[PDB]
Amino acid sequence: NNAARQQFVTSEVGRYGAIYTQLIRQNLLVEDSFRGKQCRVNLKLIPTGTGALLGSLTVLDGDSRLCAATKRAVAQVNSFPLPKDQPDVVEKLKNINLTVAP
């Protein structure tokens, strides 16, 4: 609608993206072979009350062993936070690309 709103949405996607990546990292089982490796994923999230739950996870590319660990880590996240009354931000957060690393 306006440039200022676009800036806010872009900022919020970055902020929540980082929150989500941290939640995944906290659940990730650490292994030496993951050093310097990454797994790129897409999350589709389903709004659930005040937050969101996992709908689907797509592994885009990355280290095979780290990606397997990432799948379990994502499956172990209790909930993903969403902003209150910011539907345009929620639209982007419901379909989000993340990079997971140890």
């Binding site: 659930t48 009350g49 739950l53 689907s56 996870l57 592994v59 885009l60 209790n78």
Partner: protein
């Protein structure tokens, strides 16, 4: 849903608390099987602010197009371990 066993997409499905680990689900016309990794089935049951429920990760099996006479998955109480999912798209 991309209904191919070689998909890189995993679907999370929700079930009622105390469900057995639901093995196969007909989800949006696609037959999905529970995923298993080095730590066992990718499945857990929780009791929290989102209520009492279970969740599993699922991917399409090789065989598709079978129409089974199965019950609907239970999303509140204990589900059958082979069931048809009550899926509906967003805002629909």
């Amino acid at each position: 849903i991309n209904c191919d066993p070689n998909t890189t997409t995993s679907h999370q499905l929700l079930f009622g608390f105390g469900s057995p680990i639901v093995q196969s689900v007909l989800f949006d016309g696609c037959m999905l099987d529970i995923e298993k990794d080095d730590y066992g089935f990718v499945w857990s049951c929780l009791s929290n602010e989102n209520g009492d429920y279970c969740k599993g990760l699922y991917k399409p099996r090789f065989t598709q197009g079978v129409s089974p006479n199965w019950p609907m998955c239970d999303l509140s109480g204990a589900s059958a371990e082979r069931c048809i999912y009550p899926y509906c798209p967003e805002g629909e």
